[PDB]
């Protein structure tokens, strides 16, 4: 039976009784930096049980007229435990991730979700001259949501959040070129993606650069009949993997 997993990281454990396979990045598992690729020449810090564990974000409600949600990935964990405290005292850092999206409903509900992970998901603005400001591009472990309409040009600094363009000007059906899974309420209950470190430099600052984006888009909308449960949540759980830091300084 392929339907059961068990993931153990630190002092936390996930158990699943209804699951698909585990998608591993681009075939690569996360690992520490080697001596041939290093450029910063002082010794890095590896706490490795205090940071590499499962942190759970907030929950969102899947409604019937629901369009989608997104998260910027080294930003939702910026106030979570000892992971968000090492980011404030250090200048560099590199991390791999393990994402577990989970949503349960009965055999009398239907719907489908696409869970992708997009590296360098640069987004656009509703006014054609400006760029979006920081408060709309991300939130502290709170979802920013798409909408089925088009944001007008009368606003100045807001993200263009039409779902069929995916915020980036591309087709939403072609997002399956990135590592992804589906959640089908007929057969599935969760989705698990393992992502390595992807950048053009061996280390980077985690406060000026978001290098991953997790999107959850309902392709088939949620439907049920009269009498069934109307409230269906979605919960996301992220665990850092093989994290290390460089450049101690003041607290920023």
């Amino acid at each position: 039976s392929d339907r059961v997993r068990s993931i153990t990281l630190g002092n936390s454990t996930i158990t699943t009784q209804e699951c698909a396979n585990v998608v591993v990045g681009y075939g690569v598992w996360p690992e520490y930096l080697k001596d041939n690729e290093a450029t910063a020449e002082d010794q890095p810090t590896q706490p490795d049980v205090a940071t590499c564990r499962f942190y759970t974000l907030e929950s969102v409600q899947w409604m019937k007229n629901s369009a989608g949600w997104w998260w910027k990935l080294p930003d939702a964990l910026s106030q979570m435990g000892l992971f968000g405290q090492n980011m404030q005292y250090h200048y560099l850092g590199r991390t791999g991730y393990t994402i577990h999206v989970q949503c349960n409903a009965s055999k009398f509900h239907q719907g489908c979700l696409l869970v992708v992970c997009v590296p360098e998901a640069e987004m656009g603005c509703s006014n054609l001259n400006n760029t979006p400001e920081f408060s709309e591009l991300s939130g502290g472990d709170s979802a920013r949501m798409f909408t089925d309409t088009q944001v007008g040009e009368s606003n100045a600094k807001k993200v263009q959040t039409a779902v069929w363009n995916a915020g980036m000007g591309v087709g939403v059906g072609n997002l399956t070129i990135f590592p992804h899974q589906w959640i089908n309420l007929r057969t599935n209950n969760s989705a698990t993606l393992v992502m390595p470190y992807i950048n053009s430099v061996p280390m980077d600052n985690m406060f000026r650069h978001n290098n991953l984006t997790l999107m959850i888009i309902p392709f088939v909308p949620l439907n049920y009949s009269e009498g069934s449960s109307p409230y269906v949540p979605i919960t996301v759980t992220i665990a850092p993997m093989c994290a290390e830091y460089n450049g101690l300084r003041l607290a920023s």
Binding site: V28, K107, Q110, C112, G173, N174, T176, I198, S200, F219
Partner: protein, 237 residues
């Protein structure tokens, strides 16, 4: 003074030449290479990845997520058609904009098989059986399930495994086909019919949906690189 003689084709700029040229910055030390995940060596690795197909254009679903959903009901008769489109992976507006149909619009010739995957995104208590057919050209489009069963078909039974693959084989008189629309190199039609009904229990919604995917097999190839007609410009940005 060695005696030489210059041929036609001298002092010309052919934009696809293969020559050596002197470097403008001599003795430069480039940054050493790093192992970044996800290296692309061939463009055919991109085209062999599934992509959702918008079969439901219908004049007002294109600015919506409803273009990707195929409606499925419970009927009072038998043998109705679900969808149907001609197999033109670079000229027909259904398969035009997908991940396979964008690589083909950079080339002129194509050859190989095509996979079509269908997923049933309905309730876990609903059943059904479908017919996924392919008809080579020479006749028209099949108008019944009696005419569509004479071609190449598969019967899909919806159960615990929620997907099925209809693998369109390479049936052609030539070795390659044109990407642009051409009646000499047509490829045929792909249809879908009801085999039995969608039987549903009480307190379950009858209307379900089906998603569609498309990709390429491992014998697919392309030829004669050209420009794409999918971009414009008026002035410099």
């Amino acid at each position: 003074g060695l005696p030489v003689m210059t041929t036609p084709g001298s002092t010309q700029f052919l934009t696809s030449d293969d020559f050596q040229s002197p470097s403008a910055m001599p003795q430069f030390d480039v940054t050493p290479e790093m192992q970044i995940p996800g290296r692309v060596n061939n463009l055919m690795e991109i085209a062999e990845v599934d992509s959702v197909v918008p079969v439901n254009n219908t004049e007002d679903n294109v600015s919506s997520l409803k273009a990707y959903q195929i409606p499925v009901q419970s009927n009072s008769d038998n043998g109705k058609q679900v969808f149907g489109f001609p197999l033109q992976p670079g000229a027909n507006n259904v398969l035009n904009r997908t991940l396979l149909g964008e690589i083909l619009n950079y080339y002129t010739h194509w050859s190989g098989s095509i996979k079509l995957t269908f997923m049933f995104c309905g309730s876990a208590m609903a059943t059904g059986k479908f017919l996924l057919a392919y008809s080579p050209p020479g006749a028209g489009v099949p108008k019944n399930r009696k005419d569509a069963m004479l071609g190449t078909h598969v019967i899909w039974d919806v159960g615990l495994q929620s997907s099925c693959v209809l693998c369109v084989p390479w049936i052609s008189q030539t070795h390659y086909r044109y990407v642009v629309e051409d009646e000499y190199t047509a490829a045929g039609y792909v249809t879908c019919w009801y085999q039995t009904n969608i039987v549903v229990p009480a307190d379950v919604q009858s209307s379900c949906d089906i998603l569609c995917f498309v990709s390429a097999c491992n014998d697919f190839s392309v030829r004669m690189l050209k420009d794409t007609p999918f971009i414009r410009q008026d002035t410099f940005y």
